[PDB]
Amino acid sequence: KVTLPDLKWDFGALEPYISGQINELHYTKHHQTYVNGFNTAVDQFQELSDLLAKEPSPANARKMIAIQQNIKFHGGGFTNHCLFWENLAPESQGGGEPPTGALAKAIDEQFGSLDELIKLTNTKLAGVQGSGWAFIVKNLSNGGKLDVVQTYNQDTVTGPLVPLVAIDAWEHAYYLQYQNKRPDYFKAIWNVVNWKEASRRFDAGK
Amino acid sequence: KVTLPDLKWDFGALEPYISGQINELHYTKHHQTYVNGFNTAVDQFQELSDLLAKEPSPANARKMIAIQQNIKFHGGGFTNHCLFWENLAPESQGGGEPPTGALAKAIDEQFGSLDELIKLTNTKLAGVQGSGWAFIVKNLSNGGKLDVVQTYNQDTVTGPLVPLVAIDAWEHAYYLQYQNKRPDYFKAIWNVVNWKEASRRFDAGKI
Amino acid sequence: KVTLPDLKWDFGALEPYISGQINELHYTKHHQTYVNGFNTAVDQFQELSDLLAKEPSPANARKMIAIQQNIKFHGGGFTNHCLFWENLAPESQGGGEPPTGALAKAIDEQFGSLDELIKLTNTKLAGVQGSGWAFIVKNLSNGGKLDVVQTYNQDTVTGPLVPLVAIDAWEHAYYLQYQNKRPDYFKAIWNVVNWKEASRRFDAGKI
Amino acid sequence: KVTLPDLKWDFGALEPYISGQINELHYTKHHQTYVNGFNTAVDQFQELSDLLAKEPSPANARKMIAIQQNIKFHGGGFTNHCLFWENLAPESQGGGEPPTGALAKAIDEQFGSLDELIKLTNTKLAGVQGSGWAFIVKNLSNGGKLDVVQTYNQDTVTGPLVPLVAIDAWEHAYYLQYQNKRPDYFKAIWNVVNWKEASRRFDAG
Ligand SMILES: [Mn+2]
Ligand SMILES: [Mn+2]
Ligand SMILES: [Mn+2]
Ligand SMILES: [Mn+2]
């Protein structure tokens, strides 16, 4: 059974970049919905697995096929938002401060500068044509190199792709404050990105 | 734990429309792979579920997300092939004979004739751009009306879309015999379609 | 060059069901974005098509492939919103009034009642996991039968699936008024659905 | 108008790794189908484009949406196969010989060895659940770093992802020789991969 994670900051601590009203809805309603949906999906899979074991029919296999979509969607919603809150922080907790150490070295070597990486990520965010996410990732399969990837809906990065910074591009992440002005949101959010957490994720490779 | 279903006919019973060599590989290799993959994926889900209950971390949920794809793909492969074998039959067992009862009525009313429904299905099959399936379905949500739908890979028809006839359009379903000539396969298969099973599925409104 | 369509109603005319604030942003900003993106994509097509004629290389075909997604997405956004505005009307212009003629007959025959069709549509809307649309359609391939289809992003219904009622499920269609309470929006919108236009589309069997 | 490209080798030249029977069908039938489909789709879109200029209706935009699917699929089929023939070669033309220069240095730095990159690519190929491709790519957006990406159907790599080696995982690429033994085909194909072409693509970007 999963639950909402503890936040490291108060709902209004990311103002003026992200409003307290958005954070409260985003956490208490949206993230909670994924929590509930994931727990439900996993319970349903347990029931269907037990059913399939005693009656291993195509009919019962078809029922299991039907709920894996919910496990993927709600599981992704649960995990993506957990990553998101952990890579946000108010300026008083280091939000917006550049990364140091090995991550900073890799960023300059690969993208030239942090600003160039941020600009690339904002282009990737703008290019999400629907609901989705951008992630700055470390790829463990190609020698640990940085990349920026897009996902749709609540799809996430798995396997050798370790998420370092997750940025939510669903309209509920910004609409109450920015309405249609999504580039203003993508620009603003970097002021409260926690690069210390990004560096930790980079160093651990988890 | 799932297993290969019993066949209602021998591998060579659908000759010359579908070769015995294809049926043998299709069943003993391809369908078996989905059986194994599905069993493995469900066991893996179980293992991860037990772990999540003790450590409900985002990291463990992430692992479960990865396994979902395999449950979907192999579960689909298992289910779709089971449907496929059950809607094929040699002529001696009624393969190629038209449906009767309520299904026959519905077909003429919606498509004009069985031949027109078959033509539409062959167009849908030709339109699969990659691996996939076409299904003649009964839609329980719109008053039980017939339709033809396409799926990709091992996606299948679920919920209110009840499969009546499943036709495999993966290249392994025909390539050894027809090579690139996929429309020849799509034309040929109707000679061994089991419309009695289709009628049964239509009446039952379920698998 | 495509442009924003004329609206048949004032921005605030669908209140209380959809706020004037939402309609104004939805039309002047969101729909405009798709108009701009589609015009840009088509111009880019033309440039690349000309280039390909002179230099029919894989590299140039690769550039053409890259632009296809923008044509699809923005084309869909343009088309879907045009459909949407035309199937909404204030109560004073008949919004919420049931369809008549051949469409009303089809609805009762397939769904039992208009209420049952609306409930199905709301379930399909609720099932959109991300941004998307639901469409009540007439399927020209199966004898003209009604159905409800979901799409994601700005995917749309093409070919034999003729849209009769389009309902937008993107968060921008409701969030300023309803926030997370998407089912309340899906319930409310029917009060301003223009079933006369749905009937017109049903009879025409085209856009 | 696109056409089938010239091959640099005879149909049977890749035996015993890929049969002449397969190459002949794969080129003269399958690739030709994509050539024809792409030409048809581009012509259709041009007609619709000229029409939209005079009648910029939702009805006409809807027709254009329908055609783009064929542009993507057949365009991908056309380009992916062009890449494929150019990154295959018989042993007599250097097939199977390791890359050199900058590409070889990048491979060792990122993957440890060519063998390790090949093993990774084979895992990516094995993971294609349906028809599709694996590509070894140079990513121009992250400093030119190598990666391996999977695509489905005739989807391809575009923009900053430069294809260096394309490997076809559609069943028609192997079934006549390997039938269900897809992993054996993935293992075998490296004996006729043209890494000289891969190195050229890497250096050019
Ligand atoms: Mn969110
Ligand atoms: Mn099959
Ligand atoms: Mn909209
Ligand atoms: Mn091929």
Residue at C203 is within a domain: yes
Q: Are residues A68 and A98 in the same domain?
A: no
Q: Which of B110, B136, B142, B164 to mutate to test the interface with C (most CBs of C within 10 A)?
A: B142
Q: CA C43 to CA A143: how far, in whole Å?
A: 41
Q: CA B151 to CA D130: how far, in whole Å?
A: 12
Reduced 3-state DSSP string for chain B: CCCCCCCCCCHHHHCCCCCHHHHHHHHHHHHHHHHHHHHHHHHHHHHHHHHHHHCCCHHHHHHHHHHHHHHHHHHHHHHHHHHHHHCECCHHHCCCCCCCHHHHHHHHHHHCCHHHHHHHHHHHHHCCCCCEEEEEEEEHHHCCEEEEEEEECCCCCCCCEEEEEEEECCHHHCHHHHCCCHHHHHHHHHHHECHHHHHHHHHHCCC
Residue at B13 is within a domain: no
Orientation angle between helical segments A101-111 and A195-204, nearest 10 degrees? 90
Q: Are residues C71 and C99 in the same domain?
A: no
Question: Cα-flanking dihedrals φ and ψ of residue C163, to 5°?
Answer: -75, 135
Q: With an 8 Å Cβ cutoff, are A175 and C171 in contact? A: yes
Q: How many CB atoms lie within 10 A of CB B24?
A: 13
What's the gap in Å between B169 CA and the centre of ligand 1?
Answer: 38
Q: CA B98 to CA B104: how far, in whole Å?
A: 8
**Chain D residues within an 8 Å CB radius of A142:** 110-111, 145-148
Which residue matches tokens 């209950």? B53
Tokens of A107: 């960023």
Are the C-beta atoms of residues C207 and D58 closer than 8 Å to each other? Answer: yes
Q: CA A190 to CA A167: how far, in whole Å?
A: 9
Tokens of C48: 């690349």
Q: With an 8 Å Cβ cutoff, are D142 and A141 in contact? A: no
A149 sits in which H/E element: strand A145-152
Q: Are residues A48 and A60 in the same domain?
A: yes
What's the gap in Å between C170 CA and the centre of ligand 3?
Answer: 6
∠ at Cα C58 (C56, C59), nearest 5°? 100
Tokens of D66: 């329908």
Q: Is D74 annotated as a binding residue?
A: no
Q: CA of A77: how far to CAs of A129, B145, C63, D73, in Å?
A: 18, 36, 34, 31
Residue at C8 is within a domain: no
Q: Is D81 annotated as a binding residue?
A: yes
Which residue matches tokens 């893996």? B44
Residue D172 distance to chain B (closest CA, Å): 7
Q: CA A27 to CA A17: how far, in whole Å?
A: 16
Residue finishing a domain among A89, A106, A132: A89
**Is B150 buried (19+), middle (13-18) or exposed (0-12) by CB count in 10 A?**
middle
Q: Are residues C83 and C114 in the same domain?
A: no
Are the C-beta atoms of residues B164 and B144 closer than 8 Å to each other? Answer: no
Antiparallel, parallel or unpaired: β A145-152 and B132-139: unpaired
Q: How many CB atoms lie within 10 A of CB D120?
A: 19
Q: CA B51 to CA B45: how far, in whole Å?
A: 10
∠ at Cα A76 (A70, A79), nearest 5°? 135
Q: CA of C179: how far to CAs of A81, A184, C183, D20, in Å?
A: 18, 20, 10, 62
Q: DSSP 3-state assignment of A190?
A: helix
Q: Which residues from C are below 8 Å from D when comparing CB atoms?
A: 1-3, 5, 38, 42, 45-46, 49, 52-53, 56, 58, 61-66, 68-69, 71-72, 75-76, 78-79, 82-83, 156, 158-159, 206-207
Of A4, A197, A12, the closest CA to residue A103 belongs to: A197
Please tell me which of the candidates C3, C62, C158 has its beta carbon nearest to residue D62: C158
Q: DSSP 3-state assignment of A95?
A: coil
> How far from the centroid of its chain's Cα atoms is residue A49's Cα?
29
How many separate domains does chain B show? Answer: 2
Q: CA D74 to CA D31: how far, in whole Å?
A: 9
Of A156, A136, A132, the closest CA to residue A146 belongs to: A136
* Nearest residue of chain B to residue C145 (CA atoms): B145
Q: What CATH number does residue C176 fall under? A: 3.55.40.20
Q: Which residues from B are below 8 Å from A when comparing CB atoms?
A: 1-3, 5, 38, 42, 45-46, 49, 52-53, 56, 58-59, 61-66, 68-69, 71-72, 75-76, 78-79, 82-83, 156, 158-159, 206-207
Q: CA A96 to CA A196: how far, in whole Å?
A: 10
Orientation angle between helical segments C32-54 and C58-86, nearest 10 degrees? 150
Are the C-beta atoms of residues D111 and D172 closer than 8 Å to each other? Answer: no
What's the gap in Å between B199 CA and the centre of ligand 2?
Answer: 23
Q: With an 8 Å Cβ cutoff, are C142 and B142 in contact? A: no
Q: CA C139 to CA B100: how far, in whole Å?
A: 24
Residue at D4 is within a domain: no
- b/e per residue, C88-99, with b = 16+ CB within 10 A? bbbeeeebeeeb
Q: Are residues D108 and D72 in the same domain?
A: no
Question: Cα-flanking dihedrals φ and ψ of residue D130, to 5°?
Answer: 135, -160
Orientation angle between helical segments B101-111 and B195-204, nearest 10 degrees? 90
Bridge partner list, D137: D147, D163
Q: DSSP 3-state assignment of A96?
A: coil
Tell me which ligand sits closest to the C-alpha of residue D171: 4
Q: With an 8 Å Cβ cutoff, are C179 and A29 in contact? A: yes
**Which DSSP category does A91 fall into?**
G
Q: Are residues D205 and D152 in the same domain?
A: yes
Q: Are residues B82 and B140 in the same domain?
A: no
The whole domain housing C138 covers 90-207
Reduced 3-state DSSP string for chain D: CCCCCCCCCCHHHHCCCCCHHHHHHHHHHHHHHHHHHHHHHHHHHHHHHHHHHHCCCHHHHHHHHHHHHHHHHHHHHHHHHHHHHHCECCHHHCCCCCCCHHHHHHHHHHHCCHHHHHHHHHHHHHCCCCCEEEEEEEECCCCCEEEEEEEECCCCCCCCEEEEEEEECCHHHCHHHHCCCHHHHHHHHHHHECHHHHHHHHHHC
Q: Which long-range contacts (CB under 8 A, 24 or more apart) does B107-113 make?
A: B107/B146, B109/C143, B110/B145, B110/B146, B110/C142, B110/C143, B110/C145, B111/B146, B111/C142, B111/C143
Q: With an 8 Å Cβ cutoff, are C148 and B142 in contact? A: yes
Q: What CATH number does residue C77 fall under? A: 1.10.287.990
Q: CA C127 to CA C183: how far, in whole Å?
A: 10
Antiparallel, parallel or unpaired: β D161-168 and A145-152: unpaired
Please tell me which of the candidates C29, C152, C176 has its beta carbon nearest to residue A130: C152
Are the C-beta atoms of residues A81 and A166 closer than 8 Å to each other? Answer: no
Antiparallel, parallel or unpaired: β D161-168 and D132-139: antiparallel
Residue C202 distance to chain D (closest CA, Å): 15
Q: CA C2 to CA C81: how far, in whole Å?
A: 13
Residue B144 distance to chain C (closest CA, Å): 8
Q: Are residues B207 and B120 in the same domain?
A: yes
Q: CA C133 to CA C166: how far, in whole Å?
A: 7
Q: CA C30 to CA A139: how far, in whole Å?
A: 35
Q: CA C194 to CA D133: how far, in whole Å?
A: 47
Q: How many CB atoms lie within 10 A of CB B206?
A: 11
Q: DSSP 3-state assignment of A113?
A: coil
Torsion of CA C172, C173, C177, C182, to 10 degrees: -100
Way it was determined: X-ray
**Is D175 buried (19+), middle (13-18) or exposed (0-12) by CB count in 10 A?**
buried
Residue A206 distance to chain B (closest CA, Å): 8
- b/e per residue, B96-133, with b = 16+ CB within 10 A? eebbeeebbebbeebbeebeebbebbbebbeebbbbbb
**Chain C residues within an 8 Å CB radius of B109:** 143
Tokens of B6: 């019993």
Residue at A7 is within a domain: no
Residue at B9 is within a domain: no
Q: How many CB atoms lie within 10 A of CB A61?
A: 27
Tokens of C109: 């025959």
Which residue matches tokens 């998420």? A163
Q: CA of A53: how far to CAs of A46, A182, B83, in Å?
A: 11, 49, 20
Residue A113 distance to chain B (closest CA, Å): 30
Reduced 3-state DSSP string for D103-153: HHHHHHHHHCCHHHHHHHHHHHHHCCCCCEEEEEEEECCCCCEEEEEEEEC
Q: Are residues C83 and C96 in the same domain?
A: no
Bridge partner list, C167: C134
Residue finishing a domain among A89, A114, A131: A89
Q: DSSP 3-state assignment of A47?
A: helix
Q: CA B64 to CA C130: how far, in whole Å?
A: 20
Q: Are residues A131 and A165 in the same domain?
A: yes
Question: Cα-flanking dihedrals φ and ψ of residue B165, to 5°?
Answer: -130, 125
Which residue matches tokens 């989905």? B34
Residue at D13 is within a domain: no
Documented resolution in Å? 1.6
Q: Are residues A95 and A145 in the same domain?
A: yes
Of B125, B199, B137, B115, the closest CA to residue B168 belongs to: B125
Q: Are residues D76 and D94 in the same domain?
A: no
Residue at A166 is within a domain: yes
Q: CA A195 to CA A197: how far, in whole Å?
A: 5
Residue finishing a domain among C55, C89, C123: C89
Q: With an 8 Å Cβ cutoff, are D65 and C72 in contact? A: yes
Are the C-beta atoms of residues D14 and B164 closer than 8 Å to each other? Answer: no
Of D161, D156, D155, the closest CA to residue D142 belongs to: D161
CB-facing half-sphere around the CA of B114: CA atoms within 13 A: 15
